Write a protein that binds this ligand. Sequence first.
Ligand code: 6R8
Ligand code: ZN
Lengths: 212, 213
Amino acid sequence: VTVFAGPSRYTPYVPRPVAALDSPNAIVRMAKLVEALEEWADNYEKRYTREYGGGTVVPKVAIGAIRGGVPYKIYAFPELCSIYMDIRLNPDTNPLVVQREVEAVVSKLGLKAEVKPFLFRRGYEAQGIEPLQNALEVAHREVVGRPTERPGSPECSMWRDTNPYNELGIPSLTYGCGGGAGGGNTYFLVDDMLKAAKVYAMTAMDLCNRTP
Amino acid sequence: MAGSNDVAKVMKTLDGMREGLIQTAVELGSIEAPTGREGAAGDYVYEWMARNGFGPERVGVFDDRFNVVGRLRGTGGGASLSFNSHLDTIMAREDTARFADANDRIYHEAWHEEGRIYGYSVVNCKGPMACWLIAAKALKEAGAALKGDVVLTAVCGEIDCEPVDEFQGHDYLAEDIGARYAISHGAISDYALVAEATNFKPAWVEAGKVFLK
Ligand SMILES: N[C@@]1(O)CC=C([N+](=O)[O-])C=C1C(=O)O
Ligand SMILES: [Zn+2]
């Protein structure tokens, strides 16, 4: 998202006082936009929360980077400034819908901006997962001792390589020991690791002996 | 002072130098010289000074980013006066991060039209530079009587760029290698007029600065 403003002036000529949204300094305008997008982000995750058989997706938004002007030439403020947004999608949301929502946040502030997607990947719920799900369930109950619990939303609402497998028609789930790094956790119990290896081996001995 | 009508002779001599004045300004202005790459402009000025017998020297921290200092030597016993303008200009090969319109003809060229000379690089600062270059040429060729030296100082890195963080050294330096360096290494005089576009209004106070990260 790149906000435009200007015109740029050598610092001794900068016009003041100016209202933030009217600032010729794109950085100052972007600061207002950031606040409105944060408000949008709070509600976005609520509005696009969605339950699936495979987990509950809570798609979140973060502003992961900002840059405007260059540090080695700061005597004239910039006429444009850019932020880079990470917007998660539930599997049933078209990226364009989200682009429009962000464009609308810009428009309501009365700003001029360019809203450009530079990445789009789809998320997937596995289809026909049951044979792996079952082999895993049986293995898990044996090795770990209780039924599996549904995963927390964050672990259902991220990127994992189950997406490419499911996309390519290979039913795929994610499972392993430990709390999640993104969380974030910092160690594994060796014992848990061994339970994981046994669950994996048993899942294979079940599943790979079923006829496809 | 000044003189008698030693002045009249020099004024007419300058009248006859109108084409040189325009030519110098256009040629200088046409050279690409964003802060960081003032060398070619420096070379132009060095040769211009050499041609006209001002015995220029390159005075620089870097061999491709330097100041140029020449002199019109006086006869003795007078105050010396420096004329000074800078060699660097504003918009680099592509300052798309600062300006949204980083490439218009006016931003990167210079030409004679009507009775005007167009180009940001003329305004800042090749035009004022041409003015005292010509002034000195006239003084010299008119045989003006001057007890004091005139010092001709074309400096690199006037524009407020600065190294910071990972942007260090040669490509990002400016004022540290410009005027103060030139003066500290010989370009001294009793007084100094800095030629910039001020619409004939003289200033003799300026701001300092502190940059904060
Ligand atoms: N999907 C990831 O591998 C990518 C990035 C991080 N992270 O931003 O900490 C965490 C992941 C995780 O859930 O392990
Ligand atoms: Zn200047």
